[PDB]
Design a binder for this molecule. Structure first.
Ligand SMILES: CCCCC/C=C/C/C=C/C/C=C\C/C=C\CCCC(=O)O[C@H](COC(=O)CCCCCCCCCCCCCCCCC)COP(=O)(O)O[C@@H]1[C@H](O)[C@H](O)[C@@H](O)[C@H](O)[C@H]1O
Ligand SMILES: CCCCCCCCCCCCCCCCCC(=O)OC[C@H](COP(=O)(O)OCCN)OC(=O)CCCCCCCCCCCCCCCCC
Ligand SMILES: CCCCCCCCCCCCCCCCCC(=O)OC[C@H](COP(=O)(O)OCCN)OC(=O)CCCCCCCCCCCCCCCCC
Ligand SMILES: CCCCCCCCCCCCCCCCCC(=O)OC[C@H](COP(=O)(O)OCCN)OC(=O)CCCCCCCCCCCCCCCCC
Ligand SMILES: CCCCCCCCCCCCCCCCCC(=O)OC[C@H](COP(=O)(O)OCCN)OC(=O)CCCCCCCCCCCCCCCCC
Ligand SMILES: CCCCCCCCCCCCCCCCCC(=O)OC[C@H](COP(=O)(O)OCCN)OC(=O)CCCCCCCCCCCCCCCCC
Ligand SMILES: CCCCCCCCCCCCCCCCCC(=O)OC[C@H](COP(=O)(O)OCCN)OC(=O)CCCCCCCCCCCCCCCCC
Ligand SMILES: CCCCCCCCCCCC(=O)OC[C@H](COP(=O)(O)OCC[N+](C)(C)C)OC(=O)CCCCCCCCCCC
Lengths: 124, 90, 485, 83, 174, 654
């Protein structure tokens, strides 16, 4: 009833009681059930798509609405990457040159031959 | 005993005899395996080069590494079917 | 001599039926004799020859009852290579295990059941010996009435619909197989597993012929358009029917795509491997995804078998030596590890509680610790967790499928994830939690069940630690089917 | 916590608080099997050990580089770098 | 090679004639009537028949014996389920363990051993020996080098040359 | 006597024998035996490290063939590299100390035979994962440590959250395993082998797009196991397993495996600049993200797990800067730190009668637990990199390696890592203040019954405190010399920036993280006692922000509702609407209805008339008329008679 896919399987059921789906975790823990673990009385009617509302289902957080939390998450991500990318413009530059190498940049040492010096070469 | 059966081709033979066709089949197959152990010999030689060389393996066995990576697309099992179903130069 | 052996043996059988009501002791004895005979044949097998070693002809005109020494041959040929003998060894070590698997649960009419199970095992044994297309096809559908009678008489509530589906879908794909076999036999005027790579057909005659054989293989290694009889014929079969089916029939169609299609449809096969890759990726992903919402317990292992056969088909259709070898290793290792899972769900779990719904079973460790040990070891062995033979097959088939097309190899590599999701989702539900309030405590696993399990686990572990032990049969047949010009 | 348990059930890793009376006596057997297996695996894998460096001469790898240059001369195979 | 007594078996059958059905012979939740049934269990357990009588005897002896062992097996196992019956130990052989541990399991270990030693015979060991034989064919001077120099001289010859004859086979291609 | 072989065989004995003989030997024997054997193993690996400091001449052992197929051979080959012995001594030391610790920590738990067997199989497959010498044995150990992580996080099978937590951990790792199978397939395709020697001998020749594909797949594997920001949810959800399992799985072992994948692949990483850039920015993301969770979360075990993955990001920053000696040295010291921190946390959880984990419920325990205090103070002063201790030498030199890089925008990650330096002081002081210095929050009887634990709990804390003090100063010349030939990694000559990064640093930039890390620590403790209103404001904006940072930077909600629950809903869509819905309408459920209707129509074809004879004799007339009319149409044109016959079938069958 409550979810959109639970609404989607409405016309396929016939001779089936059409329960309101309620998550088995968001039930009270202190009401005594027949199984304390699954939080279920012994002959209680099961919803369609009951394994999405079982105890063994996802954890189903309570504190934020899900659209709120997607806004907050994509918020923090674009906060970090935006500050990351604007902070590349305000950098200072170096106090040394990048160091260079003998034997014409070790090209024979880095595999190489004389036709292949730009492919396997260093600063010289 | 290390017996060496004779080498037969797909081209001299009549295909209506089965003896010669089966031998040309097995010949082409075993020749691909000989090719393959040549490739494996160069691979073990190259890793011996790398382990003995240490830091200068770039220049001691540039040519062994180039040889292994040039042999690798061409030295494998290819199958007798592709040559026996089709004739080039025809 | 050979007739006197048989009417001695028929008299042996008649006397032990007269003095013992059951058959099962003699069926076990004949099964283990068949084992020893096939291993003596493997001793005398020449691995250095590509040709077919132990040939015999049945129903020749010059000798209709018996062997044939003739200038002219129009009967049914039989003989083996290493590729045939791999599946023969896998078949022959499973036949005593399925006769043993129902040693106590079938009570009412036992002798009929064990005769049907041994008869199905013998038909599938002779399937791998065959050397004509018509000799392959005759034994290829001799199984179906025996399967119909077995599924219909023995089973759960719904064994009528399952028996109908195992006749219907199999017959419906295999009739189009017969269409292509008839076209081959009227063009070539020979049906033969020996000569048939020498004949070259036209390209558009090949592409007509290839369709009917591939439709039957799509029905029997069940790829996505018809993958659908399989959960119901598993979920409602008896135990040996399920075990023989998912250990041998699916691998039989995996054998048929090598034996029947790759030699004389080469130039067709190259044109069609993207369509096979569509269908096999699409039966890996969508079936592996549809297992996540299943209420029943044998149906999960049926859908698992779909996903593993979908991995094996892109190994055989990879045009690579690695893919062919990995598909053979996958078929043999799957034929080991999956009947053990069907024994876990159908033997140790349905004999004790007679329900198969997932919602009753929780916390099986605290009363059955070694059953739970078996469940987790088999779950990980089924996933693609290495040193198991399943990972060797899955890894080499994914590698061959990456060579033939790297993008469908990239999206086919996620089967490692998808195969583990549903399997571990089932396994932690079965093992974890407080013990179920619905289940009353029963016996732990017995000696015969542990015996079957230990054999089917050691034989995956030996292939998983060293897959080289059966390369000596396959190194010809891994080069035989490659078409790389 | 020492809640009661059923002694019905037999697991290979022990059960709940598994502590047999002859655990000294069995411990001597486990001691012997462990040291014998470790000693035997220790000596069995001895010739399968080798060092990483110093196995083959440098003569070997110099002439293998030379023969790789030979196999590269005969096929006219060009460098990575020249295009 | 063994034989049985028939009027032992007919006295057995009329012993079982006045006994209750096995569906109530133990449902009494004692040895006034439960001490004659454990005798009958112990008589089920021992082998009356051997193989020489199986072949040379006729059939109503066999039918007599068959319903005898059916009712005796019933009296053994139902007493074992409800409750010789009144003992508890572990030495026991069920019906399948004779030809699964002594025929199936050694045949399977035989299959393992035949696969392991049949793996010596393969194309990779043979192909390395053939490639060595071919370079010893072409260059026999490697023959009189000493033993571990021979190894690397073979390897440098393998790197220096094709030694296939694959283009030899494709004469129609060339 | 074979040193390379005993390292392998002794934890396998230590695993196989507690299972096969657990009922026969019992817990009091198997505990001492399992620990005894791992003690002998780690003494052997210390001695082997001491010998390899003599000559850099490693040992491999060879075993039988895994598979020989055409161009591809795989062998079981095992060598101890310098990199291998570096990881090996750390994992065996932490292994043996966690074994000795759990002797006394698990004293009243029933099932410790299975527990110690699972600990030593975890150790064993870690040994195999590190000492393997192709990518295949790396994969084998890589999977079996995930199987053991299932079997260890789910040790209490009765607990529901433990079962679901082990399920989430193994499915995250399996995501990474799928990407490693992809990269492994490309490895065996491109190089034709899996052996490290052949792949690193030919790595500089291979095309760079190929190597970007390979290293991205292997980095998604390493990123899943070493718990970066896309995939961090399972570390924090692995605290349902017990304390020494968490000190195995999070201090060294299971998170080090993902760093070991990149440290092996360093020689094939160098020829890529693309992947290393991505590695660096993912790690710079996770340092900040894990520090920001860890300041605002409240469970002690979760704070220490996020304290792990704040430093894993520092190590992958050191990967991204092309400096693998730094990441390896930090990897070495971090194991000793976090093992001491997890075990001191377990001793204060064990010492409280309540067995609570909320630090809001701890209160002051300085007077009552001085030994746990001094060990946790050593551990946190080392992890804050305060000088003279191991974390100085491991952790700071990465932060100035960010500045002394050659590339320009590495300067930005200088600040980012530095920010996470300050934050890793902050929560650390929280978990020293609210636990030892605060006014008490628990009831009085906990403070009556607070005592110190056994010798089995206190002795590994002593040994790892000594190690976490002295290990950096002894092993610094091994891993940070200015010219060192110990680790046989080959840095490209331009990606090597070590000589530049120790000399080009400002007085201010080197002075800065030391003095600031000590100033923020002293300020956070003095403000939480003297004032305590700065952190207990109740602006609802700061409470919203606090509960964002408390619920793991809302990531597990974003993963749960939008990937897990979404995927379960689409899988139900397939299992109902496609497989049972529309593939049966083209299958056995639709064909039954079609044949029912067609049969009903052709049977009612002659239902009408009372007469048999008039019915059938008119029926004969209709056909010998109709067929004649059809062929009259049909020799004119064949196209105009196909729909006539379709319509005749329609009116006949419907
Ligand atoms: C190309 C692909 C070929 C694959 C096609 C698979 C189709 C197979 C298939 O539907 O199973 C069947 C057979 O229905 C045919 O008539 C068998 C197949 C009829 C149509 C054949 C294929 C048409 C291809 C057209 C080109 C559909 O009835 P069905 O089994 O419920 O009918 C059964 C029913 O299951 C039982 O419960 C009843 O008790 C029993 O009396 C009987 O009614
Ligand atoms: C077609 C018909 C051919 C029949 C061939 C039967 C050959 C049986 C020979 C073995 C033998 O000696 O059996 C004798 C046995 C005696 O008959 P019985 O009913 O037991 O007499 C009881 C008297 N109180 O008789 C029997 O054991 C009964 C044998 C009946 C066989 C029924 C087979 C049903 C289908 C089985 C699966 C299909 C097998 C084919 C596929 C493989
Ligand atoms: C060397 C020795 C080889 C001997 C092989 C003998 C095979 C036949 C043995 C056999 O069939 O016995 C099984 C059973 C015996 O029946 P029974 O004697 O009554 O048992 C008494 C129990 N105290 O026999 C029976 O019960 C059969 C009863 C008739 C069953 C009819 C229903 C099943 C029909 C399925 C046939 C399917 C045929 C399909 C067509 C082709 C398929 C390949
Ligand atoms: C259910 C419906 C489906 C069921 C279908 C069942 C198929 C059964 C087919 C029977 C196949 C018979 C093949 C027998 C082969 C036995 C044999 O090979 O040797 C025994 C003898 C021939 O001697 P042989 O040495 O082979 O002579 C040629 C030498 N070059 O040959 C013989 O004497 C064997 C005689 C067998 C007679 C059986 C008659 C039917 C009995 C039922
Ligand atoms: C019921 C479905 C209907 C299907 C109908 C199709 C045909 C059915 C025929 C049923 C029986 C088929 C099996 C017949 C076995 C014959 C055995 C045989 O042919 O061996 C002889 C062959 C030649 O040997 P040779 O050296 O020439 O000297 C002869 C003296 N031994 O020796 C060799 O060269 C080696 C060959 C070894 C034989 C191995 C055979 C493996 C399978 C044996 C069990 C099969 C039982 C099948 C029964 C169910 C039928 C499906
Ligand atoms: C490579 C191949 C490796 C294969 C090794 C095979 C080892 C098999 C031996 C495991 C047996 C241990 C066992 O029996 O555990 C039973 C365990 C119950 O634990 P227990 O302490 O007895 O508590 C009793 C009441 N709960 O029941 C349980 O809790 C279930 C956990 C069992 C742990 C199995 C450990 C081995 C798993 C290896 C996975 C290999 C995957 C392939
Ligand atoms: C590009 C590389 C870089 C990417 C970086 C960013 C990555 C973001 C995406 C990450 C995806 C990670 C892998 C997803 C599978 C993880 C599965 C899992 O963790 O299951 C957990 C869930 C229990 O979780 P929970 O109950 O919330 O916590 C329990 C602890 N108290 O267990 C259960 O509830 C069991 C039932 C559900 C099991 C999952 C079923 C749905 C899984 C759908 C995944 C589909 C992936 C393939 C999609 C493509 C298919 C073509
Ligand atoms: C970490 C997971 C490993 C699991 C180990 C399981 C037990 C296997 C121990 C074999 C070690 C060994 O016997 O090896 C040693 C030998 C030799 O080695 P070689 O180099 O090939 O020959 C020498 C080459 N020379 C000459 C160049 C040096 O091996 C073999 O060739 C025999 C292969 C037999 C493998 C059969 C395995 C069957 C399954 C057994 C388990 C159910």
């Amino acid at each position: 009833i409550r979810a959109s896919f639970d609404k989607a399987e409405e016309p396929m059921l016939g001779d089936y009681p059409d329960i309101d789906p309620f998550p088995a975790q968001l039930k009270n823990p202190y009401k005594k059930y027949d199984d304390q673990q699954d939080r279920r009385n012994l002959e209680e009617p099961l919803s369609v798509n009951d394994d999405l509302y079982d105890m063994w289902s996802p954890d189903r957080f309570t504190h934020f609405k899900n659209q709120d939390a997607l806004k907050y998450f994509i918020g923090f991500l674009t906060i970090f990457f935006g500050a990351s990318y604007v902070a590349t413009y305000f950098v200072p530059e170096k106090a040394a040159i990048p160091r260079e190498f003998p034997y014409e940049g070790l090209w024979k040492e880095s595999g190489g031959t004389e036709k292949s010096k730009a492919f396997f070469g260093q600063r010289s | 005993e290390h017996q060496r059966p004779e080498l037969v081709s797909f081209d001299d033979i009549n295909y209506n005899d089965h003896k010669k066709v089966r031998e040309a089949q097995e010949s082409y197959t075993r020749e691909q395996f000989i090719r393959l152990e040549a490739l494996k010999t160069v691979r073990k030689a190259l890793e011996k080069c790398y382990e003995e060389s240490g830091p200068n393996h770039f220049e001691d066995c540039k040519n062994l590494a180039e040889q292994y990576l040039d042999m690798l697309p061409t030295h494998r099992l290819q199958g007798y079917l592709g040559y026996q179903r089709n004739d080039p130069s025809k | 001599f050979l007739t006197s052996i048989l009417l001695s043996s028929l008299y042996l059988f008649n006397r032990i039926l007269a003095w013992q009501g059951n058959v099962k002791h003699f069926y076990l004895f004949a099964s283990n004799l068949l084992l020893l005979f096939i291993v003596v044949l493997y001793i005398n097998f020449n691995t250095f020859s590509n040709s077919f070693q132990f040939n015999f002809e049945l129903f020749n005109s010059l000798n209709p009852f018996g062997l044939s020494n003739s200038d002219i041959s129009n009967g049914l040929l039989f003989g083996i290579d290493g590729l045939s003998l791999t599946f023969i060894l896998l078949t022959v070590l499973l036949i005593p295990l399925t006769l043993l698997g129902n040693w106590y649960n079938i009570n009412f009419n036992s002798n009929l059941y064990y005769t049907l199970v041994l008869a199905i095992g013998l038909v599938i044994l002779l399937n791998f010996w065959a050397l004509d297309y018509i000799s392959f096809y005759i034994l290829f559908e001799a199984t179906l009435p025996l399967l119909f009678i077995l599924i219909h008489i023995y089973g759960s509530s719904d064994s009528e619909r399952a028996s109908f589906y195992v006749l219907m879908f199999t017959l419906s794909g295999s009739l189009f197989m017969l269409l292509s076999i008839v076209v081959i036999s009227i063009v070539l005027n020979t049906t033969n597993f020996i000569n048939h790579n020498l004949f070259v057909l036209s390209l558009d005659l090949q592409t007509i012929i290839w369709l009917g054989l591939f439709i039957a293989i799509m029905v029997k290694t069940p790829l996505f358009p018809i993958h659908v009889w399989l959960p119901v014929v598993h979920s409602e079969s008896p135990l040996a029917g399920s075990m023989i089916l998912a250990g041998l029939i699916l691998k039989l169609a995996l054998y048929a795509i090598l034996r029947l299609l790759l030699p004389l449809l080469c130039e067709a096969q190259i044109l069609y491997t993207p369509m096979i890759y569509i269908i096999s990726l699409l039966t890996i992903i969508l079936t592996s995804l549809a297992t996540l919402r299943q209420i029943d317990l044998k149906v999960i292992i049926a859908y698992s078998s779909i996903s593993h056969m979908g991995i094996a088909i892109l190994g055989v259709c990879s045009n690579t030596s690695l893919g062919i070898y990995g598909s053979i290793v996958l078929g043999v290792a799957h034929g080991f590890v999956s009947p053990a899972l069907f024994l876990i769900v159908g033997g140790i779990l349905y004999d004790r509680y007679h329900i198969r719904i997932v919602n009753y079973y929780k916390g099986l460790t605290t009363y059955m610790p070694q059953l739970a040990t078996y469940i987790i070891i088999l779950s990980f062995a089924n996933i693609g967790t290495p040193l198991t033979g399943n990972f060797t097959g899955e890894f080499l088939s994914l590698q061959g499928g990456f060579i033939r097309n790297p993008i469908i190899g990239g999206i086919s590599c996620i089967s490692v994830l998808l195969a583990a999701i549903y399997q571990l989702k089932l396994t932690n539900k079965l093992t974890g939690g407080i013990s179920s309030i619905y289940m009353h405590r029963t016996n732990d696993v017995t000696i015969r069940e542990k015996f079957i399990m230990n054999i089917l686990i050691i034989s995956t572990l030996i292939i998983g630690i060293c897959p080289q032990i059966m390369y000596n049969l396959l190194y010809w047949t891994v080069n035989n089917y490659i078409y790389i010009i | 916590g020492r809640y009661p348990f059923p002694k019905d059930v037999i697991s290979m890793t022990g059960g709940w608080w598994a502590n047999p009376s002859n655990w000294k006596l069995n411990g001597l057997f486990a001691t012997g099997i462990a040291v014998g297996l470790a000693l035997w695996v220790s000596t069995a894998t001895l010739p399968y050990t080798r060092r990483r460096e110093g196995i083959t001469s440098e003569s070997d790898i110099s002439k293998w580089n030379a023969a790789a240059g030979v196999w590269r001369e005969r096929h006219g195979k060009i460098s990575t770098g020249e295009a | 090679l063994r034989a049985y007594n028939e009027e032992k078996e007919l006295a057995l059958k009329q012993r079982l004639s006045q006994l209750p059905p096995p569906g109530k012979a133990f449902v009494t939740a004692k040895e006034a009537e439960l001490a004659e049934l454990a005798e009958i269990a112990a008589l089920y357990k021992t082998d009356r028949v051997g193989i020489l009588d199986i072949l040379l005897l006729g059939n109503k002896h066999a039918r007599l014996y068959r319903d005898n062992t059916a009712l005796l097996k019933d009296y053994y196992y139902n007493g074992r389920r409800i409750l010789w019956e009144i003992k508890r130990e572990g030495a026991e052989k069920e019906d399948w363990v004779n030809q699964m541990y002594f025929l199936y399991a050694p045949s399977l270990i035989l299959l393992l051993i035949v696969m392991v030693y049949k793996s010596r015979e393969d194309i990779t060991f043979w192909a390395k020996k053939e490639l060595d034989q071919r370079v010893l064919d072409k260059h026999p001077e490697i023959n009189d080098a000493p033993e571990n120099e021979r190894d690397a001289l073979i390897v440098e010859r393998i790197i220096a040359g094709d030694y296939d004859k694959l283009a030899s086979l494709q004469k129609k291609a060339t | 006597y074979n040193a390379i072989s005993l390292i392998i065989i002794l934890p396998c004995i230590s695993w196989l024998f507690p299972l096969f003989f657990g009922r026969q030997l019992g817990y009091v024997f198997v505990t001492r035996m399992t620990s005894t054997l791992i003690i002998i193993t780690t003494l052997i690996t210390y001695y082997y490290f001491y010998q390899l400091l003599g000559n850099n001449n490693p040992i491999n052992l060879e075993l039988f063939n895994y598979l020989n197929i055409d161009y591809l051979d795989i062998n079981y080959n095992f060598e101890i590299d310098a990199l291998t012995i570096t990881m090996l001594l750390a994992i065996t030391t932490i292994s043996s100390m966690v074994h000795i610790y759990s002797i006394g920590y698990m004293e009243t738990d029933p099932h410790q035979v299975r527990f110690f067997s699972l600990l030593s199989m975890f150790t064993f497959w870690m040994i195999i994962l590190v000492t393997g010498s192709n990518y295949f044995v790396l994969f084998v150990g890589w999977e079996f440590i995930g199987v053991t992580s299932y079997l260890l996080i789910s040790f209490w099978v009765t607990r529901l959250q433990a079962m679901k937590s082990a399920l989430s951990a193994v499915l995250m790792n399996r995501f990474g395993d799928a990407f490693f199978v992809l990269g492994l397939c490309v490895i065996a395709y491109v190089f034709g082998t899996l052996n490290y020697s052949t792949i690193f001998a030919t790595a500089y020749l291979i095309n760079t797009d190929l190597l970007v594909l390979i290293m991205l797949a292997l980095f998604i594997a390493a990123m899943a196991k070493s718990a970066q920001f896309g995939l961090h949810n399972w570390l924090t959800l692995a605290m349902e397993g017990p304390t020494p399992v968490s000190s195995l799985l999070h201090a060294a072992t299971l998170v080090t495996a993902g760093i070991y994948l990149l440290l092996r692949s360093a020689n094939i990483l160098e020829y890529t600049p693309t992947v290393l850039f991505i590695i660096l920015w993912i790690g710079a993301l996770t340092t900040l993200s894990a520090g920001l969770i860890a300041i605002c979360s409240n469970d002690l075990k979760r704070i220490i797990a996020l304290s792990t993955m704040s430093q894993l990001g520092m190590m992958t920053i050191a990967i991204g800067l092309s400096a693998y000696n730094l990441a390896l040295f930090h990897l070495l010291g971090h194991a000793f730190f976090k093992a001491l921190l997890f075990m001191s946390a377990g001793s204060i959880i064990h010492s409280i009668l309540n067995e609570s984990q909320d630090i809001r419920t701890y209160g002051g325990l300085l007077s009552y637990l001085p030994y746990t205090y001094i060990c946790i103070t050593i551990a946190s002063l080392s992890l804050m990199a305060m000088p003279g201790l191991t974390g100085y030498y491991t952790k700071d030199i990465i932060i100035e390696s960010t500045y002394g890089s050659y590339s320009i925008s590495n300067y930005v990650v200088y600040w980012i890592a530095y920010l996470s330096a300050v934050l890793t002081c902050v929560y650390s002081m929280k978990i020293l203040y609210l636990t030892f210095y605060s006014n008490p929050n628990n009831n009085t009887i906990t403070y009556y019954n607070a005592h110190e634990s056994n010798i089995y709990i206190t002795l590994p804390m002593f040994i790892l405190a000594i190690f976490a003090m002295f290990a950096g100063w002894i092993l610094k010349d091994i891993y940070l010399g200015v010219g060192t030939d110990f680790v046989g990694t080959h840095i490209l000559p331009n990606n090597f920036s070590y000589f530049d990064t120790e000399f080009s640093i400002t007085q201010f930039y080197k002075l800065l993280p030391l003095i600031s890390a000590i100033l923020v620590s002293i300020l956070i403790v003095v403000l939480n006692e003297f004032f305590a209103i700065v952190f207990n404001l109740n602006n609802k904006y700061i409470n919203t922000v606090y509960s964002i940072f408390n619920q793991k930077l809302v990531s597990d909600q974003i993963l749960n509702h939008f990937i897990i629950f979404k995927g379960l809903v689409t899988s139900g869509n397939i299992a109902h609407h496609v497989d049972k819905g529309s593939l049966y309408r083209l299958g056995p459920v639709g064909i039954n209805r079609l044949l029912n209707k067609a049969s009903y129509n052709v049977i009612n074809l002659s239902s009408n008339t009372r007469s048999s004879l008039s019915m059938n004799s008119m029926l004969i007339l209709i056909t010998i008329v109709s067929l004649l009319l059809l062929v009259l149409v049909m020799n004119v044109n064949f196209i105009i008679v196909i729909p006539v016959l379709i319509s005749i079938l329609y009116i006949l069958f419907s």
